[PDB]
């Protein structure tokens, strides 16, 4: 049951209803547009989409009327064309002569629409209105005047960011999309509007003026600031990154991107590892040849073959580096597979893979009929996911619940109490909430990574799983990658003090304690910033950032897609793993691989599910079997459960790269002042 | 497997230690346009590009960084690189899912 409809000539068995615009989109012919935007909302303003009915005398907005009953529509009909010229002259009647300076100038949609359709002669002959700027935050550079009131951005704010601070104001001309009152508009999706804004009326200050669109090369890859793994188009003006933009992908970001990630690159430019730096006799860091340093430690770590030596990854690194370091750790007799997050491992969620997986696809989240948040507030760790659940929140009336925090998510949701309390109670169906959890179709249990530490992480996991068991009975970065390859405990809790720790990035865990240092001050530091880990570490190894490396990263869903090369390492630094493939070769325990692709073949042994970059699906261990697998432990719990972030300013700084950022510092200064 | 490596004068280095990366290009997201999106192209991997000691120019070593080629079909592209004996990284066309839209759903209640 789907209606036939004629695009200009040929018949098309179009889906029932659906807008004329979507019909021609289906035939692929493209109507001129502005205010409309899928992944947003339809609106009748900006009637640049007018098209002519096969018979009905007057044109109608293309994104308005759904197609039906064998309609024919002449997109190329002359009356349509006169209509479009008609509108375009009006839009250009006031947009200021700013093309050379407006930063949108390379690809502003308004230009191209002016070329393809708009009449070339001007025939306005009076005076343009122009208006004062409205300052808004550290980021967006509002200029207005170039504003054309496709409300768009407000439809962005009210319907996705969820903030409704900004809005239209006034009537006729003088009406303005600027928010009344000086108050600053900060939000986590504030960055994406710089993408969404039709023209140059809103463009990113940090990137401003720096470059022009026809110039930059546009590499495709994925974000690393989050393990969410959203697709992106990094853009570089020759040998140097210029600006980041989202690259649409249905399973994750879908045309959107975060915000901390959007401005994350800026930190790369500042302080960064360049040459190896030995401690001098004075204890000062001092620049050194790459060769003498690597040979030095290469001989140094042989004495302690067996245990002793203890490599320590950061929170950002690095699939190829982990396989390489893995063979570094098995060719040596004993080893320390130590991540950073204090993630519990007894009862083994790792071996079954699925327990650390987010079982439903995030693409599947809109299908779930209830969500059970645990401690962590999603916006400050999986912002895209927060966008996803909000998206369905409008699409569906489905329930959600906090278990538990006072955190300010944009939408209505039930708030609970304390960990063992509300958790084990609903687990034992003591909570009324357990009932609604019972009648719910495809229930979703959202447990944050932050909640797992909290002194007794294992207890919380056991409690939440029970809830999973009940529903079934009733019926009706640097993280997921390692667990795809079993580097548990991951926690530094193995110690047992082990001499000669080997940081991949001590900028994160070096804040903790240097307790092994009096026993052994020596710490190889393979970072890419002088932050935290470098000062308290002998022997420094310069290393590549994520833009350079081909190395894959795993989506929390378990999708394991890779970043592509962009701008090469800044100085003497090499790609991280390659230093290790050098090291093993020096030790005499040369590893079987050498090329990136040979060692992709080594993922093709040690996993080999990573070598399926977009393929989340698996045989699944089944939740009941995992439950039985964990059933033999069980231990004492406690009420409190507070997510790490809470405030947004807390969100602005996490990994060392973000604190190397100028602009993020400007933002944390901004919200605080 | 019509290998033609001997016929092309290309140095072995660049039929070997680098890879093509076939894909259909993503829409520039600043744009609302769709035209440039379609049709396969055959970008190569980036290599090193430093800086001129004088004037600061982005001096560059690799023979063929800027090369890029359009196509009508992916199979044709893969087969193309195979004729060249090229290493490759084919990627899926990722057309957006069709979506429901309704001006009146905005006015449910």
């Amino acid at each position: 049951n789907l209606i036939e409809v004629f695009v200009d000539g040929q018949s098309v068995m179009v889906e029932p209803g659906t807008t004329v615009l979507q019909a021609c989109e289906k035939v692929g012919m493209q109507i001129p547009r502005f205010c409309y935007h899928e992944r947003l909302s339809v609106a009748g303003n900006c009637r640049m989409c007018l098209v002519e009915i096969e018979k009905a005398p007057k044109v109608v907005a293309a994104c308005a009327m759904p197609v039906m009953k064998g309609w024919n529509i002449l997109t190329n009909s002359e009356k349509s064309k006169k209509a479009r010229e008609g509108v375009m002259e009006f839009l250009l009647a006031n947009h200021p002569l700013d093309c050379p300076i407006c930063d949108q100038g390379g690809e502003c949609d308004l230009q191209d629409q002016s070329m393809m359709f708009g009449s070339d002669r001007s025939r306005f002959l009076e005076g343009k209105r122009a208006v004062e700027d409205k300052n808004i935050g550290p980021l967006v550079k509002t200029i207005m005047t170039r504003c054309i009131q496709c409300t768009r951005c407000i439809r962005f704010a009210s319907e996705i960011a969820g903030v409704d601070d900004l809005g239209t104001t006034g009537r006729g001309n003088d009406m303005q999309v600027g928010t009344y009152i000086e108050k600053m508009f900060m939000s986590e999706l504030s960055g994406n509007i710089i993408d969404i804004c039709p023209v140059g009326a809103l463009t990113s200050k940090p990137y401003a003026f720096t470059a022009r669109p026809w110039e930059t090369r546009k590499t495709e890859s994925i974000d690393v600031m989050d393990a969410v793994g959203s697709n992106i188009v990094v853009s570089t003006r020759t040998g140097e990154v210029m600006r980041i933009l989202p690259r649409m992908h249905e399973d994750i970001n879908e045309e959107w991107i975060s915000d901390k990630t959007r401005f994350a690159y800026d930190g790369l430019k500042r302080q960064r590892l360049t040459q190896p730096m030995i401690r001098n006799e004075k204890g000062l860091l001092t620049y050194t040849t790459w060769e003498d340093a690597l040979s030095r430690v290469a001989g140094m770590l042989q004495s302690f073959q067996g245990n002793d030596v203890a490599a320590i990854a950061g929170g950002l690194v690095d699939a190829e580096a982990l396989v390489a370091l893995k063979d570094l750790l098995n060719r040596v007799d004993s080893d320390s597979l130590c991540t950073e997050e204090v993630f519990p491992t007894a009862g083994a969620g790792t071996d079954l893979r699925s327990n650390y997986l987010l079982n439903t696809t995030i693409a599947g989240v809109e299908e779930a009929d209830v969500i059970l948040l645990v401690g962590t507030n999603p916006r400050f760790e999986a912002p895209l996911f927060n966008a996803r659940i909000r998206k369905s929140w409008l699409h569906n009336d489905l329930k959600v619940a906090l278990i538990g925090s006072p955190v300010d998510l944009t939408y209505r949701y039930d708030h609970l109490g304390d960990s063992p309390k509300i958790l084990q109670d609903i687990a034992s169906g003591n909570h009324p909430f357990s009932q609604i959890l019972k009648e719910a179709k495809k229930p979703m249990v959202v447990l944050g990574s932050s909640a797992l530490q909290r002194s007794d992480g294992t207890a919380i996991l056991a409690a939440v799983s029970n809830i999973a068991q009940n529903i079934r009975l009733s019926s009706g970065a640097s993280q997921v990658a390692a667990l795809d390859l079993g580097y548990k405990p991951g926690v530094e809790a193995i110690r047992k003090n082990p001499p000669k720790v080997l940081f991949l990035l001590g900028a994160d865990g070096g804040c903790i304690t240097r307790q092994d240092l009096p026993k052994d001050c020596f710490i190889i530091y393979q970072g890419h910033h002088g932050d935290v880990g470098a000062p308290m570490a002998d022997v420094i190894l310069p290393g590549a950032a994520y833009t350079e490396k081909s190395a894959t990263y795993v989506n929390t869903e378990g999708r394991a897609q890779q970043t592509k090369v962009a701008v090469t390492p800044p100085g003497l630094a090499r790609e991280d793993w390659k230093i290790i493939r050098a090291l093993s070769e020096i030790a005499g325990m040369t590893l079987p691989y050498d090329t990136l692709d040979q060692v992709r073949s080594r993922l093709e042994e040690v996993s080999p599910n990573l070598v399926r970059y977009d393929d989340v699906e698996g045989a699944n261990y089944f939740q009941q079997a995992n439950e039985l697998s964990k059933l033999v432990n069980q231990q004492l719990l406690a009420d409190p459960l507070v997510p790490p972030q809470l405030t947004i300013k807390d969100f602005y700084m996490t990994d060392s790269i973000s604190r190397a950022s100028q602009t993020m510092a400007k933002c944390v200064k901004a919200v605080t002042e | 497997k019509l290998d033609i490596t001997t016929l092309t004068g290309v140095p072995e280095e660049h039929i070997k230690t680098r890879k093509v990366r076939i894909f259909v290009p993503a829409r520039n997201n600043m744009q609302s346009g769709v035209n440039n999106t379609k049709k396969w192209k055959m970008e190569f991997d980036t290599r090193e590009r430093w800086e001129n000691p004088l004037m600061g120019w982005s001096s560059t070593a690799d023979p063929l960084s800027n090369l890029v080629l359009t196509f009508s079909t992916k199979e044709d592209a893969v087969a193309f690189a195979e004729k060249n004996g090229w290493s490759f990284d084919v990627e899926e066309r990722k057309v957006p899912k069709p979506k429901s839209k309704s001006y009146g759903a905005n006015f449910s209640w």
Partner: peptide, 18 residues
């Protein structure tokens, strides 16, 4: 001559011991 200052401005190890 070269114009537009610098690039990476890489950080260096502190003078103080440990």
């Amino acid at each position: 001559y070269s114009t537009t200052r610098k690039k990476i401005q890489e950080w260096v190890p502190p003078s103080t011991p440990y």
